[PDB]
Scaffold this active site. Structure first.
Site, PDB file in Angstrom:
ATOM      1  N   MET A 182      75.935  50.672  44.657  1.00  0.00           N
ATOM      2  CA  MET A 182      75.651  49.687  45.297  1.00  0.00           C
ATOM      3  C   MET A 182      76.851  48.836  45.832  1.00  0.00           C
ATOM      4  SD  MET A 182      74.622  47.154  42.245  1.00  0.00           S
ATOM      5  CE  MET A 182      72.816  47.608  42.381  1.00  0.00           C
ATOM      6  N   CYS A 183      76.900  48.295  46.952  1.00  0.00           N
ATOM      7  CA  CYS A 183      77.734  47.272  47.598  1.00  0.00           C
ATOM      8  C   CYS A 183      77.531  46.032  47.115  1.00  0.00           C
ATOM      9  CB  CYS A 183      77.901  47.582  48.959  1.00  0.00           C
ATOM     10  SG  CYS A 183      79.416  47.240  49.894  1.00  0.00           S
ATOM     11  N   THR A 184      78.829  45.303  46.933  1.00  0.00           N
ATOM     12  CA  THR A 184      78.418  44.226  46.168  1.00  0.00           C
ATOM     13  C   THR A 184      78.532  42.771  47.257  1.00  0.00           C
ATOM     14  OG1 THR A 184      79.506  42.454  44.700  1.00  0.00           O
ATOM     15  CG2 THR A 184      81.056  43.836  46.133  1.00  0.00           C
ATOM     16  N   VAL A 185      78.621  43.220  48.534  1.00  0.00           N
ATOM     17  CA  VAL A 185      78.545  42.123  49.560  1.00  0.00           C
ATOM     18  C   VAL A 185      77.074  41.362  49.823  1.00  0.00           C
ATOM     19  CG1 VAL A 185      80.458  43.177  50.847  1.00  0.00           C
ATOM     20  CG2 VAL A 185      78.131  44.100  51.504  1.00  0.00           C
TER      21      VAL A 185
END
Ligand code: ATP
Ligand code: ATP
Ligand code: MG
Ligand code: MG
Ligand code: ZN
Ligand code: ZN
Lengths: 113, 320, 320, 113
Positions: free
Chosen positions: B213-216
């Site tokens: 998962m990307c944190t943006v």
């Protein structure tokens, strides 16, 4: 979507055919929230037993869906978060759609800050 | 010029009570000691919303440093601040806004359940340090960025009996909620961040990759979650009305979840789940009985936690 | 270090497109020239939300100075900034956050309908200055604090055909909405801030006293209105879907109103009202035909405006 | 509130008695939003003519209420902002409560920034 691929008639039918045949199971359609960032599988149809808790139903979802234990999720039932310690039946008694099925959405839990 | 400034800000607050909500209690808010676990995007916005409300004592707890991409999203830091420790820069930052603020920055590392203990004594000190901080403040805001970092603070805060406001972001959504507190006289306790699933919080960062998962997130979620979080605290701080779950500032929801794609917001409520790996009675008992000894075990063995709260007795039941 | 910083912020934006919304258009947002009419609480928050989104060209328009009570509520100013002109300090402030920002501050006074013209030539220059600014930018954010200050900008913006996002606060609520634009091919035009009442905006400050109305609001409204305002702009900037009023970033409401006491948010829509003292066809014709000559009249005679748009022909009708 | 001081029966009654007597008027109850900062008067009952526009009905409200022209207001009708150029009748046709009356709320317009 399930409703988007079947009319009220065919849906209000398999509901009664399920109630008449398994008065112990519960017709549940479980699918991932529209804009959520987590796994999903073609199995949107579930017939869980009434005595099973929401928590227990949640375990199934993440298991069957192959979700890791590091990531959590929450479930909606008519824009509501059902107590984790409630009986899937008592939930069905309060949120069942007129089509006989209990619609449930699951989404990745928020963890950023 | 500090006097005239102090008076100016003060008058603005007084005017909302005097001319709009005479029943409003500003003093309770002003005197509230706030502990901010997290000095990132949420921590910065929540803190700005709190001085605007008149809160004077705010403490930041964060062990990181200002990254190159932090400034544009974390409203208390500038580009020149890069490389410097957050908690302190953050407190300094509030003072540049209102010099009379009692802002403090504690560079403390919150021990994360699921990760291996790297230095027992060192992380036992961290543990006590955190509890003391939670002990001295009145409202604790859980503004960290991982499921794991929320466990210890949720528990200590439940033990010290402090009010907790938890805020967490998703790419398109946000969750803002206050954890319940165990009352002897009331057999009614609201749930906590952890009462919604059936897994024990564990290491989710070590194994993490872009694939995971990307944190943006969309910039909007941070700002919203923060303001709603502070408005919840200010309302919750008001005496509620005799026959209702409302105050001078309105409702006092238990849980609030928002979504940007359809500009919505839901109020919700969930009762304390007895097998919660955080607020479950069995877990509280274990803590009261064994303190740091028990926590060390949960910290390195999340599954243990499950064995203690009963999350196993229920999966084991379904397993058969 | 500027390069590595630029790259860092840039990568964060790219990640939300690459890993979450591949259809997302970041370039359109980045290149958007933004004009902020107002550098106060809304102006500061909206501007912070825009750099986080990747917007590089932002211009502030404000003729005031940093007051003693501004800092705690206006997130771009510090206590040391008191006394100094806002627009410029504001642009300087954005640069301290992201040095590559193309931030500019124009100390311009927006002529207010209902007030007496104090210096014709001087206020005729103001007029042209404002139109030029609206002409060069792509999105205009109406973040002023009076009903009157919204009239001229609404009109010029309609004439120059720019998109307008209007945000206004109340003590407990907030309104965020985009004005419609007149399309020859579409007989469907959305309303503007002024299509909701039947009075011509006029002087409301000169005669104002505490009795009339206090200007204080709950800190939360500012933060919310700003984020929703920017998320509206970023969505609106996306190509909408063939058979719907939605884009990659979701819906694109016409009007959004929120309330804090009950943590709610409503999406709404109102068609352009033909007798609007701002977007009415009769008013646009008058402007196209007489320019500054007509505006000067409306400026000093709000009732005139009503005579022009037809707001009199309808009250006169009810009058009988 | 009006509903808070009268039951469905007595309210569903004066509605028909008004429709039967004045089939040209419209039973409207107009009161200020709960948390709004503007003037209000005991006259919550209005019987406006169907051909009158929302704008025209709004003029009445601010007039009868003694509201200055420097301050604006907006009106809700089932959490909706009715077109200012719509006929009070067409509005009644779409938002009338089962009790026969059209409930309308007015509140001070937001102007701070
Ligand atoms: N265990 C911890 N102890 C102390 N502080 C923590 C801990 N975990 C996270 N934090 C702090 O929580 C804050 C979260 O802010 P935030 O996630 O918005 O920005 P970031 O973590 O610095 O990087 P990014 O902008 O990419 O998310 C950070 O400042 C981080 O240092
Ligand atoms: N006619 C105008 N021309 C240019 N700028 C204006 C005009 N009218 C208002 N502004 C600016 O709009 C901004 C509104 O910000 P805001 O109302 O939140 O704070 P403030 O007006 O400075 O004082 P306060 O905090 O008490 O409201 C102010 O910075 C003000 O100077
Ligand atoms: Mg982070
Ligand atoms: Mg102002
Ligand atoms: Zn719990
Ligand atoms: Zn208009």
């Amino acid at each position: 979507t399930f409703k988007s691929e079947y009319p009220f008639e065919k849906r209000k039918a398999e509901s009664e055919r399920i109630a008449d045949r398994f008065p112990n199971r519960i017709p549940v359609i479980c699918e991932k929230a529209e804009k959520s960032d987590i796994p999903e599988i073609d199995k949107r149809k579930y017939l869980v037993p009434a005595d099973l808790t929401v928590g227990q139903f949640v375990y199934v979802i993440r298991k069957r869906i192959m979700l890791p234990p590091e990531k959590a999720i929450f479930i909606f039932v008519n824009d509501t978060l059902p107590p984790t310690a409630a009986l899937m039946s008592a939930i069905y008694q309060e949120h069942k759609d007129k089509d006989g099925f209990l619609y449930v959405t699951y989404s990745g839990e928020n963890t950023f800050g | 010029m500090l006097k005239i400034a102090d008076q100016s800000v003060d008058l603005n607050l007084k005017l909302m009570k005097w001319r709009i909500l005479p029943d409003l209690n500003l003093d309770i808010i002003k005197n509230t000691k706030v502990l901010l676990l997290g000095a990132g995007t949420l921590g910065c916005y929540v803190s700005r919303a709190l001085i605007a409300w008149g809160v004077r004592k705010i403490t930041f707890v964060d062990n990181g440093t200002v990254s190159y991409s932090n400034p544009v999203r974390q409203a208390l830091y500038n580009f020149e601040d890069c490389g410097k420790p957050k908690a302190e820069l953050a407190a300094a930052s509030l003072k540049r806004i209102f010099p009379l603020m009692d802002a403090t920055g504690v560079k403390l590392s919150i021990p994360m359940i699921g990760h291996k203990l790297v230095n027992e004594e060192a992380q036992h000190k961290d543990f006590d340090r955190l509890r003391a901080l939670i002990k001295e403040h009145d409202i604790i805001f859980l503004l960290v960025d991982s499921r794991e970092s929320r466990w210890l603070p949720s528990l200590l805060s439940n033990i010290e009996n402090k009010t907790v406001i938890n805020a967490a972001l998703g790419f398109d959504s946000y969750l803002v909620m206050r954890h319940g507190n165990r009352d002897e006289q009331s057999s009614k306790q609201l749930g906590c961040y952890f009462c919604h699933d059936v897994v024990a919080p564990t290491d989710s960062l070590t194994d993490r990759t872009l694939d995971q998962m990307c944190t943006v997130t969309r910039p909007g979620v941070a700002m919203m979650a923060s303001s709603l979080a502070v408005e919840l605290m200010t309302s919750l701080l008001q005496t509620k009305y005799s026959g209702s779950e409302t105050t001078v500032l309105g409702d006092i929801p238990h849980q609030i979840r928002g979504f940007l794609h359809n500009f919505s917001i839901l109020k919700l409520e969930t009762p304390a789940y007895e097998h919660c790996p955080a607020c479950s009675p069995k877990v509280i008992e274990a803590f009261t009985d064994l303190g740091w000894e028990f926590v060390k075990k949960a910290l390195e063995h999340p599954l243990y936690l499950e064995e203690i709260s009963g999350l196993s007795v229920i999966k084991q039941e379904v397993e058969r």
